[PDB]
Amino acid sequence: YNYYATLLTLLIAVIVFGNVLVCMAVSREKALQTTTNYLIVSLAVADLLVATLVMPWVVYLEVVGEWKFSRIHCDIFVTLDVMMCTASILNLCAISIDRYTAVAMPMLYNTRYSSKRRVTVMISIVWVLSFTISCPLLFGLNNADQNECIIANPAFVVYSSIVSFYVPFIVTLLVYIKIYIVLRRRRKRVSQQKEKKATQMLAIVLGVFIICWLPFFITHILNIHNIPPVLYSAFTWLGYVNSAVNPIIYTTFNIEFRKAFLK
């Protein structure tokens, strides 16, 4: 099937274009070099690595339908898929925690020396944790056959799905609704279109993260404890589309990012 090549190649190109523009914008503009924007750059790097390393072999699987490369190559492919997707999800959770620090710890957030240490620790933790989650697949824990490159371990699927998605998902959800409650509290305590804008952004980021990743993981848990395969593939491609949409929703609304993208 050569019909998948076009569509999936445009998806890869869209992801690469958006994340590269975010990285170039943050690097070039001195006003944009802040620690929250460095968390955004970490998310963009995760998405760019998804598009560059992981997705091209996923296109190969769709086109050829069978794995005609080495078995160790298949192991690298699956562990890279898990690692980069987990890194993207954990970067989203880190951005949520940073935005919470902005609202509930305004004085500590403003301090440069403490904020640098916080963000360097968060970036290190998310990347190390994604690597440690993905590493057992390198050990031949996956049981793929010679023809096909897939993950056939239900136990690893459940255990990695939990730590990689569910608890960062619950944490991000609780953190964002906490930010919403604090925003409403200060709105009651106290032009005003910015206050509705903040609500819009929280709803948009939550909705994108729910729609793109939740169906895939819930389908995995339901499967491991029948459903057709085409929607399974589409659910995986939705998770990949998360990487396409993240650099839009996390930068294109902010004005300073728009100026850099125009320039």
Ligand SMILES: CCN(CC)C(=O)[C@@H]1C=C2c3cccc4[nH]cc(c34)C[C@H]2N(C)C1
């Ligand atoms: C069809 C077979 N493939 C391709 C290698 C998968 O199932 C991939 C397995 C994933 C997976 C399992 C378990 C935990 C996880 N966290 C993050 C991901 C993940 C990414 C996720 N990708 C998108 C698909």
